[PDB]
Amino acid sequence: MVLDNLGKALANTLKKIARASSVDEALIKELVRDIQRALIQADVNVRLVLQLTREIQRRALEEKPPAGISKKEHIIKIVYEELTKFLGTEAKPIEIKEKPTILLMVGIQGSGKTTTVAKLARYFQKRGYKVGVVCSDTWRPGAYHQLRQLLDRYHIEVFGNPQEKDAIKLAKEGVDYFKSKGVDIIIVDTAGRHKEDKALIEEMKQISNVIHPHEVILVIDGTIGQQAYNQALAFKEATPIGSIIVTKLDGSAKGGGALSAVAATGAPIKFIGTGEKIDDIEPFDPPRFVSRLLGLGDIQGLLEKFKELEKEVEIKEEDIERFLRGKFTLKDMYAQLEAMRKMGPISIGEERLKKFKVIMDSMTEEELLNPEIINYSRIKRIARGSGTSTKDVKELLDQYRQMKKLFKSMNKRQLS
Amino acid sequence: MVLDNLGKALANTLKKIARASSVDEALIKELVRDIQRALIQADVNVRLVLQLTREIQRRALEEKPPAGISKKEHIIKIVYEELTKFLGTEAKPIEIKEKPTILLMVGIQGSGKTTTVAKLARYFQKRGYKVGVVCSDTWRPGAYHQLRQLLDRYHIEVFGNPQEKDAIKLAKEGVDYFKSKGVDIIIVDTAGRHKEDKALIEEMKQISNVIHPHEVILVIDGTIGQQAYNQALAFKEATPIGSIIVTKLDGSAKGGGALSAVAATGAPIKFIGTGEKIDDIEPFDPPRFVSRLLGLGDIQGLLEKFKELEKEVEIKEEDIERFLRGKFTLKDMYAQLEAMRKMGPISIGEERLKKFKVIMDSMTEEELLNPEIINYSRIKRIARGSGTSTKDVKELLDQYRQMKKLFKSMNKRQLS
Amino acid sequence: MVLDNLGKALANTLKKIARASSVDEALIKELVRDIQRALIQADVNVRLVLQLTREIQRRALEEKPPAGISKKEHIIKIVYEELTKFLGTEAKPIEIKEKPTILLMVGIQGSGKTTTVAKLARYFQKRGYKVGVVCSDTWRPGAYHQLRQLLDRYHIEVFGNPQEKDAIKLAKEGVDYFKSKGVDIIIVDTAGRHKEDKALIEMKQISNVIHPHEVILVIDGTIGQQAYNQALAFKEATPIGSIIVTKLDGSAKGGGALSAVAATGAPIKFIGTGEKIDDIEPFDPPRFVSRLLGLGDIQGLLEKFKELEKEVEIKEEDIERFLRGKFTLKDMYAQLEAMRKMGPSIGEERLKKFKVIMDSMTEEELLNPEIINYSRIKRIARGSGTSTKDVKELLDQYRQMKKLFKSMNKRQL
Amino acid sequence: MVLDNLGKALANTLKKIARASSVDEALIKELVRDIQRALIQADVNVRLVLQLTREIQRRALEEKPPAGISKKEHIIKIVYEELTKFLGTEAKPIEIKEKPTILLMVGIQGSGKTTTVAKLARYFQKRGYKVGVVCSDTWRPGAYHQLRQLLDRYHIEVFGNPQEKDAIKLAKEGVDYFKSKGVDIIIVDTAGRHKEDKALIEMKQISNVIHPHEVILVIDGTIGQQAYNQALAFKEATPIGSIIVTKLDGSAKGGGALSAVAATGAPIKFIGTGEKIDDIEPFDPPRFVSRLLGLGDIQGLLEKFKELEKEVEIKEEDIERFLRGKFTLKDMYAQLEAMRKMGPSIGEERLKKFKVIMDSMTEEELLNPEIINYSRIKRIARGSGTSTKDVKELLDQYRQMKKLFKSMNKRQL
Ligand SMILES: Nc1nc2c(ncn2[C@@H]2O[C@H](COP(=O)(O)OP(=O)(O)O)[C@@H](O)[C@H]2O)c(=O)[nH]1
Ligand SMILES: Nc1nc2c(ncn2[C@@H]2O[C@H](COP(=O)(O)OP(=O)(O)O)[C@@H](O)[C@H]2O)c(=O)[nH]1
Ligand SMILES: Nc1nc2c(ncn2[C@@H]2O[C@H](COP(=O)(O)OP(=O)(O)O)[C@@H](O)[C@H]2O)c(=O)[nH]1
Ligand SMILES: Nc1nc2c(ncn2[C@@H]2O[C@H](COP(=O)(O)OP(=O)(O)O)[C@@H](O)[C@H]2O)c(=O)[nH]1
């Protein structure tokens, strides 16, 4: 849900960077291409993708990381910052200042407008506002009842009249009525049409002149991908007070293309629709959105990994109970150590452990599993095969025998 | 590479459990079905999958977790333990005791036998052994040269004669020759055939009687999935000293079906092949393998998550520099706190923060982004909308103003 | 959309059988394995899959094709009839005979029940019947206006009272009322429940008060094989029970749900197919299974012809290039392989020999036959293992067809 | 296997054009968008994709189809010729004219060079030529025995010395020797390099000593669009350069590599296709692009016919069910829709009206036409908006076909 695949793909290019052995020009070129592929696949206009990834390439190649910041962390920064501007740079909230603050909603059939009208009403009501909705949708009068269905539970008033045929008349009667009732916010649901043709924009100019809304909000179906550009653009040109809600971002392969498309337009995206239910709407705040997108600041994720690790306890416990009965092997030790040195942030020491591994990599399975069998000629083979001395080998073995004695002789009443 | 998809799918059922709200019978039934799907998809025989998931279901449903172990952690344990037995229970290494320890390799064309012969020779040489290989493959005499190609770099002797036509003669001349040269280990590469027919098993019984190997090793192509069963079984019945290497597990959708199939047979799997290169072989140790498979003990993973998190530093840094100039918002605070309480393992307190969130969820975007605008009537709306008091609301705001004053007045010389 | 990939997976096992070189026992084991994989992935209960897939294996291993039928064609027939029986075997339509034929609809929240009430009203209305729906759904009010929303444009009476709190009362009142206005069919939408529990099935009350001709449980198909226990409990609790399975569109587990329900014997009357009023189709197992496996696809065959003709311009440019005397052995080799499928001129054995010869020519030779020396013809006959006579034969046939094209005129359609 | 999904993605855009209701400008924008997506996903350089995909858009928006060609067929022709030029335009085979025609093979480690040396020797040998390969690969010895391994069963002379440490010396010695034994073609395998750097291209040395007829760089196709810089650097450094791209089988980025190389103009002579000695095919852009897009698929059309006939048993059981007088309106409706595609009896407008009527019948009515009352016929004509006369018409046609079947005998094949 919500750009979804695009998220994973973008985050992975950033992980790759974090994990990269070093930052050369080849790393960048791959990053840029990883991003082009992810973007294009989410239906982002090709020209837009080129422009963005050429800026990212450029900034990475020729920009010195500020003091105490690696080339690597600065790349992560460049990508985050470029993507954020690519989706509108910053939040542009809806201001509620005027008394009845009037929001006029426009959109074609199947944009998800009716539903979005309910979502927006509920968003505001949840936050202590009195809301009235006015249904002036004469194009599919079933909308009055659909709004009743979505909104009655919340006692949010829905003014309508499935038996009125003048669209502008309807919108004015409604606004005046709900305005009489004392509301803070009025949301006006206008008639859809099949496409966003001249008729539709003309009808919005007319309804807007008559009711004088605080804001006109075009609802765009985000599954149309980059085709949202021209729809947003025509709208943004027919109204000095326009904003956009983009719906159906959940699961859609193409929502990325819609957001980037609308943002290329200048028009402000204020909310996104996120599913079919009344609460499935979230305000759009580019830097925060792009941050969830890229998997940044994932402290929750880190905690899940810890928790998951801890639930492995009965397994670890039985491992240890095996050690207590002396069933402890060179493989078990190999691992104990391996974990110890991968724990920063009976201790061997980094170099000595690095040597210890090298020695065991020259042992056979049967030796790792039954050290007891490791006689002297074996030791001289192990030493020869690992490029170390028979001394080192007997050292490692001593360490093993030491740790083995420990476990074999343990309280049988503890917890590691 | 290596069961790959099956790994991710199995690990996810275990993650689901770790994350589950509670452990009821419905959770189990879903786990079992998640595992059937993963298994069947990797070509594990259906009857085998039924038997395994019925045991897992049973143990989960009717088994009490030992003292101090949750139902949840005990399920994780049951799954790990069942899967481990399903793939052979424990390591059965190859013992090198006899002087020339002789390993006789059998397999059909395209099993990856020739390559596996080199991998096994190199595995042993790397570990300080003198190795000789004897190529008695009269069925595709190009094999002598292929072995030379793989093995010359290591100075591992390859006895052969692309111009000898008696297979058993060849294998005996070779063994005697390489035996004269002083080797610890001799690997004998017999002639393949098209399928594993009676001819092939008969020819192995004959060659085995003549050379008297320490072990006979059948090389099975793991991309055949569950069809490995009958091949392993026929072999295991034609020799009291048989083991198995399963090749091409890397990337293959069906290797899971091969391992489970061979293990159902009783025959010991000693190594797996892992790719085309000479080092692409690993010993098979069921509990360790099933442990990597299920993503258990992933301390490395945890460390990667930390490292990745740290590379986000230039971003966090610029966030903070915004706070220093007083550009700090209710959203920024909302987050600071949210992270603080998700950090165990200026502090508010769990209940107070839970209340704080509830209040902000009743604020609008413009309020969260510009607290300054929050006059008194707004506060009474916020308080009403959050089901709290105007006192609580002014409390939260005070906390905000406090934290805001802090940042606005900071050294501009530190690091958070 | 509906059972999408399950369909393709099954359809492919049949193509593989049609395409099979010969029908040994290993072709049956691969078919049986391929089917188990497709079914398990659609969330079919694994025990069911064994049961179905074993019978298919047996029937195919130990059954002699009737007279004039190959082993291949009988395997196809086996797979098709087993899947048909697997999914219910035969259609069991709703019977409208009584005046107010009354349908009681039950379901848990989110199963798609309320939408389904509407789709079904529309189904009948569209066919000439007068329909009225009684909304006795007191559990999630909003259901009443949802039915208004969906149904008003069809002037289908919707009786309800979003203020009535008694479910039995509302149902009784509504049925009586709608029955007054002389409707042929009454569909009653009952109150949902969070889950299908003793509370839900305890529908018996309403059913005992309104005496429905039929009681339809609406099941969300995305639950997959979990539909089994749900349909079973419901079928146990009523002698007059039928099922509608919804949300089959795009569903990964729809397969599992249909087979789950059918393994219960409760009849599947319709399937839901989308969110819109028309996304409902009556269920008819053999028709369904035939579309599923892509059987009798004349439409498919036609499309392929259409598409092949659309290539006309390209074909015509190739030919214009021949009239200009640019016509290679490559082009010829293709024209022949082509002609050996113009059915349903040179022959089938002479063509077979011509191939073999060209397969010993190099790329420059195939592309510039003009350059073919005398020694080259020796190299070729030698490499192809044929007589230089064979080689010069082919080269003549070439020279023929060539000049033939060179001396056509642009009146070539 | 080779360019797998790229092929399907492109082939589908053409099916969509063939299937298009009408050809407006939005059908071109979707085609152009669909192509950009397929190409970008195959790792084609994005700037190339713009360039190609813009030209395709223009040529289609502002070009009038020649006489007798529809807009549709011209779009198909456009897509096909652009992709062809995109991938090299026309075949450029290796020319064997000189006695020892000498081929110098270069490549970096893992590009598949040594295998490719062998596949190519085999390619020629198989066609009658005497071939000898000189292994001057001092960088990864093992290459010599690899060539022995691959080549001995063909008695293709392999000259080498895994002990010789001088690359130029070994090449010179080997060429001279092999040339003595009277080989038509000599293939020289040069030492690889970790990467294609000044060191690698500084091949000029060997080329100046043995004077090859041609120098072939072997490129690993899985590097995708990174092939461009590699082919460019190499082509700059030699007037006689050709490319072989390997590892195209299963490759996700093979597309990107072919277009990368072709945008350089260096001729692509062969492609590698697998690990085996026979997995090499000469590259011929128009042939390649035609297979890619699935053009001229007669084989495809045949397969579909074959598969449809294999359904005979099922068809025959359906019919046996008719002879028993079990033949519904469902069956009839199907027999008719069917017959309206028996081309290429009732008519096309009478059938159109029959549909409409049945579409107002319920499932019990379609399945038990016997039950169709007098009032039912009113309900139906009313719901279908036709005359009860129309309804009884259809019902007659039914009754006809029915008894007709009922009175066939089991001599029905
Ligand atoms: N998945 C999803 N569906 C949505 C969203 N918004 C609206 N829809 C659905 O889109 C369809 C049409 O929207 P609706 O408001 O009902 O009608 P409209 O006013 O004509 O566009 C309905 O099926 C809605 O459930 C969304 O954000 N996500
Ligand atoms: N990917 C992969 N390929 C393998 C493995 N083992 C062998 N192969 C390949 O399988 C093919 C045939 O195996 P090979 O040893 O060369 O011939 P054989 O003795 O006839 O089976 C070669 O292409 C090998 O590279 C493996 O573990 N992984
Ligand atoms: N895709 C799909 N969605 C459906 C189908 N039937 C119902 N739905 C959706 O399921 C959701 C819940 O169904 P609804 O009738 O509204 O509510 P219910 O009575 O509580 O189940 C609604 O969004 C419907 O649009 C179907 O057949 N296919
Ligand atoms: N799939 C595939 N693999 C190939 C192809 N050509 C070569 N290879 C493999 O690439 C690997 C390296 O090629 P090779 O000729 O052995 O070594 P090189 O000379 O160092 O490139 C070998 O495993 C080959 O089997 C090809 O066309 N397709």
Numbering used by the authors:
A (entry chain A), B (entry chain A): 1 to 345, 365 to 435
C (entry chain B), D (entry chain B): 1 to 202, 204 to 345, 366 to 434
Original paper wording:
Our structure of Pfu-SRP54 is the first full-length SRP54 structure bound to GDP. The protein interacts with the nucleotide through an intricate network of hydrogen bonds involving residues from the conserved motifs I, II, IV and V. The paired hydrogen bonds between the carboxylate group of Asp250 in motif IV and the N1 and N2- nitrogens of the guanine ring are canonical nucleotide-specificity determinant seen in all SRP-GTPases. In particular, the sidechains from glutamate Glu276 and Lys248 in motif IV sandwich the guanine and ribose moieties of GDP. Lys113 sidechain from the P-loop sits between the carboxylate headgroups of aspartates Asp137 (motif II) and Asp189 (motif III) near the β-phosphate of the GDP but does not interact with the GDP. The catalytic Asp137 is located 6.6 Å away from the β-phosphate of the GDP. Despite the presence of magnesium in the crystallization liquour there is no clear sign of magnesium ion bound next to the GDP molecule. The M domain of Pyrococcus furiosus appears as a stable and well-defined structural module with the exception of the finger loop (residues L346 to D363) that was not observed in the electron density maps. A groove flanked by helices α10, α11 and α14 and the finger loop constitutes the putative signal sequence binding site. Pfu-SRP54 appears as a flexible molecule with a stable though dynamic M domain articulated on a flexible linker that connects it to the NG catalytic core.
